[PDB]
Amino acid sequence: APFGYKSGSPESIKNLKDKIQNVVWILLENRSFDNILGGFKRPGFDNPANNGPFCIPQNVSNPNSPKWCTKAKDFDSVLNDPSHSVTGNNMEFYGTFSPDNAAIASGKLQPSQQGFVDMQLVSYPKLDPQVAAEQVMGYYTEDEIPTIANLVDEFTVFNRWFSCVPGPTNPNRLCALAGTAAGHGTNDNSFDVSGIDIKGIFQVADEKGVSWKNYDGTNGAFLPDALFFNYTAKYKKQNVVPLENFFQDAYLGLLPQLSYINPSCCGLDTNSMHPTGNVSFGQVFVKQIYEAVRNGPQWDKTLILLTYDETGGFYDHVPPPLAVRPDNLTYTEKAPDGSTYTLTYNRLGGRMPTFLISPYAPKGYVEQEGIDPATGNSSVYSATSVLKTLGYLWDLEDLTPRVSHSPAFDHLIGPQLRSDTPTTLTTPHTFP
Amino acid sequence: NAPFGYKSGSPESIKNLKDKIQNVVWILLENRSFDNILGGFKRPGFDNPANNGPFCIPQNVSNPNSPKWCTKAKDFDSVLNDPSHSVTGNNMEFYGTFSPDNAAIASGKLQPSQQGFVDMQLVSYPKLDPQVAAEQVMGYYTEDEIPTIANLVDEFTVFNRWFSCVPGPTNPNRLCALAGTAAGHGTNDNSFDVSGIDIKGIFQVADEKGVSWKNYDGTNGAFLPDALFFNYTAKYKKQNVVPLENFFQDAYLGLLPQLSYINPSCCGLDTNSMHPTGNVSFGQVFVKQIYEAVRNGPQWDKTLILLTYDETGGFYDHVPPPLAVRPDNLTYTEKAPDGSTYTLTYNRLGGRMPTFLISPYAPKGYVEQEGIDPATGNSSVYSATSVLKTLGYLWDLEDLTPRVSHSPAFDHLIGPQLRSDTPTTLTTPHTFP
């Protein structure tokens, strides 16, 4: 209880309502904790800098295979996109394309986090193993990520925050916005045609009279997250606005209560951090978002929650834990070798970087595990932690059992307004 | 006198320009005059109401007893009634009649009186309250309402004698800025919507000379950005037209091309061009974003920002537009709301606009007056084609038209020593409903 009140307590919830009127919510793309935050030799950081190096085989199948270790520095532009499908995460986490689901459910089988180099070589068989290892085992240095390092120094990072599903972008974004992937396990067609029919946060907010905007930086290459939903396409297209509108609204104090920003993704000049886009470009985006809110009139009533959607197949040494099934819908996939795997959504995805950025957040703070609000036991954070906190903020019912079991971060919003937060973040620079 | 001791077009001036400037960023905001945006600066060198006003004109130029309306401090953040910027509308504004005598204009018998601006607003909005009409076109913004602009005035160079290329609307003016001629275009016709302009523009010139360029598109897809006026661009170079966010990325990272050209979003809610209905305050955050991205990235030390408007939007300005060389032989004919017919031969400029030279080599808080017509050596006003002239010096380009040939360049305002004085941020603006 960093400020004296526990999450979900009357005092914590009242302070949250009292301090926070605007939430800015951003999912960046495809990075792990050890990849982006692995260099910070600071108290609380469970990463290669403090607890490493970590070393895993190049081929999990022969005991004699060379071992590849986490090393400082990584490519600005990762040219070979690491695997982040369900079966790809299976290889990365458990070392097999289809692990025994009953051994997983019982605890007899746990992830050893050994297949990240192997998977990269399966995906890119002609790729130099050394390069494959630098790609997925590297972590960026402070000189390579000074904008991130600024947020680390001045605000709050989560050392135990995992993606909602162990698979790709859109199952995870949907789980973050609706509390369940609802059986989606790849980037299937329903995300491209506003075919998602379940209730999402955007529809909930309209039902509760919470104003919201989906700020669209996708460049038209794909639908932003709010247009996953049948509901938004039919009733609320006007709430999906150009990215430039965000900087306009934030500098001028015109932000809605819920701001949701989509970056541009994957490829030339995109800023999501998804391979092949640059870490340097992604930091410019983060710097723009922060500075527009920070030097706008709504800074003193705002919280920025900055996360990723999933870990993008980048190495992380922390085994993802089991988790409440969000619903009974399952998803089946065929693996590279023809094997078939069924996901029952009873475990999380990889551990991600997450930042809580607000003049009420503590400075240079590292949050460890939180409290499972339904059970009172210690629990890791996950993407649906946002939906749980928003529940306290705006009196929303939890959409799913996964939301109900997700720790909130209302206790990290302090009772006093900090006046030591910076007006700019350190400018990044390309590092080819 | 030549601020840094060399004259525009001289060997020293051109050598210093080429040594200091490797990147140009070129932005045309929309539809404001000098007296409107810069009218409230009581500063040496500013010819405006703050120093020389107030200026008063009649409500109805046909009534000798018409009440007068004057320039007044403060204007709407969002002016709801878009003033006339058509060719015949400008005629009414500048000359007090829809169809002025062209022989009398060409010989000097008939000079513009700048008396029709409130009259034309009421022609366009006959139910509008005259006081509101007056406030919309006659008012000027206080420094308190435009702190982002005020920041630029204090730290860099403004032009007190800078006129739009044509006394007409947006796209004839944007075309003349980019090609040295509006080539007979006098309204926003269909050629600008179908990449149907088949003359040589700066972008084609730049590809022919090895000069990299990008047109950063902030229109949101409502209309084609300026580079896509040209079938040349649509045929061969659509990949140099990129989203607005690419500019911020490129400028902060030092990846800007040699010529960056930024299109704002236009007209209507949440747009940032300053074209009426769109707020002055939204326009100022756009300007702040562009400046800060360039200023704080690795290319600031070699960049010049030229921030202008495309035309004066029908807003009041008291300075009569001078005569000018015809860029070519193409004319344009228009029916006035009169029912009368008028022919424009492009022998006179549009209204006087705000223009800013923003660079760590530009002098600080400096006010440029008249320049030198390079074809003549005589003092002349600046116009939109002053950019093409300066770019010709910078990159060894042939002047595209005689209008370009006669435009003063601003290479003499690029100094020989890098300033460390310049701000990293511009004052945030605020909405003022």
mmCIF file of N, CA and C in Angstrom, chain A residues 213 219 241-245 247-249 251-252 254 264 268-271 280-281 284-285 287-288 291 295-296 424 427-430, chain B residues 214 220 242-246 248-250 252-253 255 265 269-272 281-282 285-286 288-289 292 296-297 425 428-431:
data_model
loop_
_atom_site.group_PDB
_atom_site.id
_atom_site.type_symbol
_atom_site.label_atom_id
_atom_site.label_comp_id
_atom_site.label_asym_id
_atom_site.label_seq_id
_atom_site.Cartn_x
_atom_site.Cartn_y
_atom_site.Cartn_z
ATOM 1 N N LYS A 213 -13.149 8.413 -26.989
ATOM 2 C CA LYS A 213 -12.721 8.519 -28.372
ATOM 3 C C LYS A 213 -11.684 7.446 -28.632
ATOM 4 N N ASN A 219 -3.279 4.678 -40.000
ATOM 5 C CA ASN A 219 -3.095 5.111 -41.388
ATOM 6 C C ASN A 219 -4.024 4.399 -42.372
ATOM 7 N N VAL A 241 -11.453 8.884 -34.466
ATOM 8 C CA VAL A 241 -10.976 10.139 -35.046
ATOM 9 C C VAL A 241 -9.487 10.027 -35.353
ATOM 10 N N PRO A 242 -8.969 10.898 -36.233
ATOM 11 C CA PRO A 242 -7.541 10.839 -36.569
ATOM 12 C C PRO A 242 -6.652 11.033 -35.351
ATOM 13 N N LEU A 243 -5.459 10.435 -35.430
ATOM 14 C CA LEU A 243 -4.457 10.546 -34.376
ATOM 15 C C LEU A 243 -4.156 11.998 -34.028
ATOM 16 N N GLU A 244 -4.027 12.860 -35.047
ATOM 17 C CA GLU A 244 -3.717 14.272 -34.825
ATOM 18 C C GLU A 244 -4.714 14.940 -33.886
ATOM 19 N N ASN A 245 -5.969 14.471 -33.893
ATOM 20 C CA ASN A 245 -6.974 14.959 -32.960
ATOM 21 C C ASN A 245 -6.558 14.741 -31.513
ATOM 22 N N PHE A 247 -3.427 15.009 -30.143
ATOM 23 C CA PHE A 247 -2.533 16.079 -29.723
ATOM 24 C C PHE A 247 -3.299 17.385 -29.612
ATOM 25 N N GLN A 248 -4.210 17.635 -30.564
ATOM 26 C CA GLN A 248 -5.098 18.794 -30.500
ATOM 27 C C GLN A 248 -5.919 18.791 -29.212
ATOM 28 N N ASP A 249 -6.606 17.676 -28.912
ATOM 29 C CA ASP A 249 -7.462 17.646 -27.726
ATOM 30 C C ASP A 249 -6.650 17.729 -26.438
ATOM 31 N N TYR A 251 -3.444 18.966 -25.775
ATOM 32 C CA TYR A 251 -2.884 20.293 -25.519
ATOM 33 C C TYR A 251 -3.969 21.295 -25.154
ATOM 34 N N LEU A 252 -5.180 21.118 -25.672
ATOM 35 C CA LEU A 252 -6.207 22.121 -25.459
ATOM 36 C C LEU A 252 -7.146 21.776 -24.313
ATOM 37 N N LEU A 254 -9.319 19.181 -24.296
ATOM 38 C CA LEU A 254 -10.572 18.684 -24.846
ATOM 39 C C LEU A 254 -10.686 17.156 -24.820
ATOM 40 N N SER A 264 0.453 3.112 -35.494
ATOM 41 C CA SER A 264 0.594 2.471 -36.799
ATOM 42 C C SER A 264 1.434 1.224 -36.632
ATOM 43 N N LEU A 268 7.284 -0.088 -42.719
ATOM 44 C CA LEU A 268 7.896 1.203 -42.996
ATOM 45 C C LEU A 268 7.197 2.348 -42.279
ATOM 46 N N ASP A 269 7.952 2.998 -41.385
ATOM 47 C CA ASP A 269 7.611 4.255 -40.720
ATOM 48 C C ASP A 269 6.505 4.101 -39.691
ATOM 49 N N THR A 270 6.239 2.882 -39.246
ATOM 50 C CA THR A 270 5.238 2.700 -38.214
ATOM 51 C C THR A 270 5.874 2.906 -36.844
ATOM 52 N N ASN A 271 5.023 3.174 -35.857
ATOM 53 C CA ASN A 271 5.488 3.593 -34.542
ATOM 54 C C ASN A 271 5.020 2.661 -33.425
ATOM 55 N N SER A 280 13.083 3.454 -32.077
ATOM 56 C CA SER A 280 13.236 4.902 -32.039
ATOM 57 C C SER A 280 11.932 5.595 -32.426
ATOM 58 N N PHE A 281 11.260 5.110 -33.486
ATOM 59 C CA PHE A 281 9.994 5.710 -33.907
ATOM 60 C C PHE A 281 8.945 5.573 -32.819
ATOM 61 N N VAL A 284 9.154 8.242 -30.233
ATOM 62 C CA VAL A 284 8.680 9.568 -30.631
ATOM 63 C C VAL A 284 7.186 9.676 -30.364
ATOM 64 N N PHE A 285 6.442 8.663 -30.808
ATOM 65 C CA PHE A 285 5.022 8.526 -30.510
ATOM 66 C C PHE A 285 4.741 8.661 -29.010
ATOM 67 N N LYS A 287 6.594 10.013 -26.743
ATOM 68 C CA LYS A 287 6.950 11.366 -26.326
ATOM 69 C C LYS A 287 5.859 12.364 -26.715
ATOM 70 N N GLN A 288 5.321 12.240 -27.933
ATOM 71 C CA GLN A 288 4.232 13.114 -28.376
ATOM 72 C C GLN A 288 3.009 12.972 -27.482
ATOM 73 N N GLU A 291 3.744 14.494 -23.936
ATOM 74 C CA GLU A 291 3.910 15.940 -23.856
ATOM 75 C C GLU A 291 2.600 16.670 -24.116
ATOM 76 N N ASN A 295 1.391 18.988 -20.894
ATOM 77 C CA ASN A 295 1.364 20.437 -21.008
ATOM 78 C C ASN A 295 -0.001 20.946 -21.410
ATOM 79 N N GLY A 296 -1.026 20.086 -21.311
ATOM 80 C CA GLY A 296 -2.407 20.470 -21.456
ATOM 81 C C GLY A 296 -3.073 20.704 -20.114
ATOM 82 N N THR A 424 9.039 17.681 -20.724
ATOM 83 C CA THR A 424 9.400 16.887 -21.888
ATOM 84 C C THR A 424 10.070 15.594 -21.439
ATOM 85 N N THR A 427 14.465 13.258 -25.916
ATOM 86 C CA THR A 427 14.233 12.912 -27.324
ATOM 87 C C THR A 427 14.993 11.641 -27.700
ATOM 88 N N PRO A 428 14.369 10.692 -28.384
ATOM 89 C CA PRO A 428 15.102 9.515 -28.868
ATOM 90 C C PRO A 428 15.949 9.877 -30.086
ATOM 91 N N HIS A 429 16.620 8.871 -30.632
ATOM 92 C CA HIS A 429 17.468 9.028 -31.805
ATOM 93 C C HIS A 429 17.546 7.677 -32.505
ATOM 94 N N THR A 430 17.619 7.684 -33.839
ATOM 95 C CA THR A 430 17.803 6.412 -34.533
ATOM 96 C C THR A 430 19.147 5.818 -34.129
ATOM 97 N N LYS B 214 9.003 15.515 -49.597
ATOM 98 C CA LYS B 214 7.826 14.813 -49.121
ATOM 99 C C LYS B 214 6.725 15.830 -48.878
ATOM 100 N N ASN B 220 -6.542 14.530 -43.742
ATOM 101 C CA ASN B 220 -7.411 13.440 -43.303
ATOM 102 C C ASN B 220 -8.168 12.781 -44.453
ATOM 103 N N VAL B 242 2.882 11.305 -47.697
ATOM 104 C CA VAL B 242 2.831 10.446 -46.511
ATOM 105 C C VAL B 242 1.940 11.067 -45.434
ATOM 106 N N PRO B 243 1.532 10.313 -44.406
ATOM 107 C CA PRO B 243 0.660 10.890 -43.368
ATOM 108 C C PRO B 243 1.352 11.972 -42.552
ATOM 109 N N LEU B 244 0.520 12.824 -41.957
ATOM 110 C CA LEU B 244 1.018 13.917 -41.132
ATOM 111 C C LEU B 244 1.945 13.424 -40.024
ATOM 112 N N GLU B 245 1.624 12.283 -39.402
ATOM 113 C CA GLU B 245 2.419 11.834 -38.262
ATOM 114 C C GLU B 245 3.854 11.531 -38.673
ATOM 115 N N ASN B 246 4.055 11.118 -39.935
ATOM 116 C CA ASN B 246 5.400 10.911 -40.467
ATOM 117 C C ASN B 246 6.261 12.162 -40.321
ATOM 118 N N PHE B 248 6.260 14.502 -37.809
ATOM 119 C CA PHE B 248 6.762 14.558 -36.442
ATOM 120 C C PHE B 248 7.842 13.500 -36.209
ATOM 121 N N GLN B 249 7.601 12.274 -36.674
ATOM 122 C CA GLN B 249 8.616 11.226 -36.617
ATOM 123 C C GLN B 249 9.909 11.672 -37.300
ATOM 124 N N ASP B 250 9.810 12.140 -38.554
ATOM 125 C CA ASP B 250 11.005 12.494 -39.312
ATOM 126 C C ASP B 250 11.741 13.675 -38.680
ATOM 127 N N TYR B 252 11.709 14.884 -35.469
ATOM 128 C CA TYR B 252 12.370 14.567 -34.196
ATOM 129 C C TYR B 252 13.585 13.664 -34.395
ATOM 130 N N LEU B 253 13.555 12.814 -35.411
ATOM 131 C CA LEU B 253 14.615 11.852 -35.624
ATOM 132 C C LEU B 253 15.666 12.348 -36.613
ATOM 133 N N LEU B 255 15.205 12.822 -39.944
ATOM 134 C CA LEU B 255 15.022 12.100 -41.194
ATOM 135 C C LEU B 255 14.245 12.919 -42.224
ATOM 136 N N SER B 265 -5.323 20.190 -42.073
ATOM 137 C CA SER B 265 -6.703 19.722 -42.239
ATOM 138 C C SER B 265 -7.624 20.927 -42.372
ATOM 139 N N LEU B 269 -15.030 20.959 -38.188
ATOM 140 C CA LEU B 269 -14.734 20.639 -36.802
ATOM 141 C C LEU B 269 -13.411 19.887 -36.664
ATOM 142 N N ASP B 270 -12.622 20.322 -35.682
ATOM 143 C CA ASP B 270 -11.354 19.711 -35.312
ATOM 144 C C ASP B 270 -10.273 19.901 -36.365
ATOM 145 N N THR B 271 -10.426 20.859 -37.278
ATOM 146 C CA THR B 271 -9.398 21.098 -38.278
ATOM 147 C C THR B 271 -8.455 22.203 -37.795
ATOM 148 N N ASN B 272 -7.259 22.232 -38.386
ATOM 149 C CA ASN B 272 -6.173 23.025 -37.822
ATOM 150 C C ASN B 272 -5.553 24.008 -38.807
ATOM 151 N N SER B 281 -7.069 28.502 -32.151
ATOM 152 C CA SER B 281 -6.384 27.737 -31.111
ATOM 153 C C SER B 281 -5.933 26.363 -31.619
ATOM 154 N N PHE B 282 -6.783 25.654 -32.372
ATOM 155 C CA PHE B 282 -6.337 24.398 -32.977
ATOM 156 C C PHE B 282 -5.174 24.642 -33.937
ATOM 157 N N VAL B 285 -1.831 24.821 -32.027
ATOM 158 C CA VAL B 285 -1.142 23.619 -31.547
ATOM 159 C C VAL B 285 -0.459 22.903 -32.711
ATOM 160 N N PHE B 286 -1.106 22.873 -33.872
ATOM 161 C CA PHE B 286 -0.474 22.389 -35.096
ATOM 162 C C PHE B 286 0.881 23.059 -35.333
ATOM 163 N N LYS B 288 2.696 24.746 -33.123
ATOM 164 C CA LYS B 288 3.579 24.363 -32.023
ATOM 165 C C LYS B 288 4.192 22.983 -32.249
ATOM 166 N N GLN B 289 3.377 22.014 -32.672
ATOM 167 C CA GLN B 289 3.879 20.667 -32.941
ATOM 168 C C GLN B 289 4.970 20.675 -34.011
ATOM 169 N N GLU B 292 8.240 22.397 -32.630
ATOM 170 C CA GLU B 292 8.954 21.622 -31.626
ATOM 171 C C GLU B 292 9.578 20.355 -32.214
ATOM 172 N N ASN B 296 13.798 20.384 -31.946
ATOM 173 C CA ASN B 296 14.391 19.499 -30.957
ATOM 174 C C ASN B 296 14.961 18.229 -31.567
ATOM 175 N N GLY B 297 15.084 18.178 -32.885
ATOM 176 C CA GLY B 297 15.722 17.063 -33.535
ATOM 177 C C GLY B 297 17.024 17.479 -34.179
ATOM 178 N N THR B 425 10.346 25.135 -26.685
ATOM 179 C CA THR B 425 8.900 25.061 -26.810
ATOM 180 C C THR B 425 8.353 26.418 -27.215
ATOM 181 N N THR B 428 2.064 27.035 -25.165
ATOM 182 C CA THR B 428 0.836 26.335 -25.502
ATOM 183 C C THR B 428 -0.291 27.345 -25.702
ATOM 184 N N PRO B 429 -1.165 27.141 -26.691
ATOM 185 C CA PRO B 429 -2.347 28.005 -26.825
ATOM 186 C C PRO B 429 -3.487 27.480 -25.969
ATOM 187 N N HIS B 430 -4.623 28.165 -25.987
ATOM 188 C CA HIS B 430 -5.806 27.708 -25.273
ATOM 189 C C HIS B 430 -7.015 28.035 -26.124
ATOM 190 N N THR B 431 -8.071 27.244 -25.953
ATOM 191 C CA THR B 431 -9.351 27.608 -26.540
ATOM 192 C C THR B 431 -9.844 28.886 -25.885
#
